[PDB]
Design a binder for this molecule. Structure first.
Ligand SMILES: O=C(O)C1c2ccccc2Oc2ccccc21
Length: 284
């Protein structure tokens, strides 16, 4: 069923809350035993958001390999994403260790450091060129190279170098700064413009490690970004683009991380974004 007609049918019937609860009911439940070990309590931002054991990212260290981060591997679409929480004061070094070890080119940030008057993640990147950051626990140095501030978002060029050797890779940083909590972007227009800037950078392409995507919990806004990207890629690949079922793609993605899409409004906005974005994919 053309999603655009499925969309109008749900809107006219006002059944978004009903559709959303049906997804919640059918979603995978896998163990998260490593996340719940007492040694890891200060590595989790939210008691109720944990990576499954089968899909969690492992840090390359013998001491403690745990980070709140999941590998979402889309087979039909040939895209991978790492979804993670906003870094905590004691996990900013782990965060950059993961980017290094997984060979990522891009970090996508969908939250502000402060929202609703509370801290939603650590200030984990440098704000001035001449004030670099050193992460002593993981032996990394991070330098701001350049910053491009636009109306809806900011792009930063960062230098990451192995202080174990001398390997130097440049990481890009895509910061959406207008998205509110459990809320929706302004018009899917600015969110789609942002998604197309990440794509144009190379950050989502198979010559690199998976993109790192976060918000505060790494399930709501983060979920909306990977769901919209994968659904548009499928529409581009298939003989019949009307065969793309957004609810079925979401349930596939929920095999790899719990809770993706946090509200019925986030589900509705994901539909809107894919419907408006398809008007480019199909040749306009
Ligand atoms: O499709 C593939 O060749 C491969 C893959 C194979 C089986 C299952 C999942 C899967 O995911 C991805 C994701 C990105 C790139 C390649 C793959």
């Amino acid at each position: 069923m053309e999603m655009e007609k499925e969309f109008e049918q749900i809107d006219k019937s006002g059944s978004w809350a009903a559709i959303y609860q049906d997804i919640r009911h059918e979603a995978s439940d896998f163990p998260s035993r490593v996340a719940k070990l007492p040694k890891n309590k200060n590595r989790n931002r939210y008691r109720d958001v944990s990576p499954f054991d089968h899909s969690r990212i492992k840090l390359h260290q013998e001491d403690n390999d745990y980070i709140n981060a999941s590998l979402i591997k889309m087979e039909e679409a040939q895209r991978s994403y790492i979804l993670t929480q906003g870094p905590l004061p004691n996990t900013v070094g782990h965060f950059w260790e993961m980017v290094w070890e997984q060979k990522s080119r891009g970090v996508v940030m969908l939250n502000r450091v402060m929202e609703k008057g509370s801290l939603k993640c650590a200030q984990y990147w440098p704000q001035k060129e001449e004030k670099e950051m050193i992460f002593e626990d993981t032996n990394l140095k991070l330098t701001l190279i350049s910053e491009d501030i636009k109306s809806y978002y900011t792009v930063r060029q960062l230098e990451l170098e192995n202080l174990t050797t001398q390997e130097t890779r440049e990481i890009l940083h895509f910061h959406y700064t207008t998205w509110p909590d459990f809320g929706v972007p302004e018009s899917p227009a600015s969110f789609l413009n942002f998604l197309f800037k990440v794509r144009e950078s190379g950050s989502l392409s198979p010559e690199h490690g998976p993109v790192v995507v976060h918000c505060s919990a790494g399930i709501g806004r983060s979920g909306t970004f990977c769901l919209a990207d994968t659904c548009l890629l499928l529409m581009d690949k298939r003989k019949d683009p009307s065969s793309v079922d957004i609810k079925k793609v979401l349930l596939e993605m929920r095999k790899f991380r719990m809770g993706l899409i946090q509200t019925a409004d986030q589900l509705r906005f994901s539909y809107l974004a894919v419907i408006e974005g398809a008007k480019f994919i199909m040749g306009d």
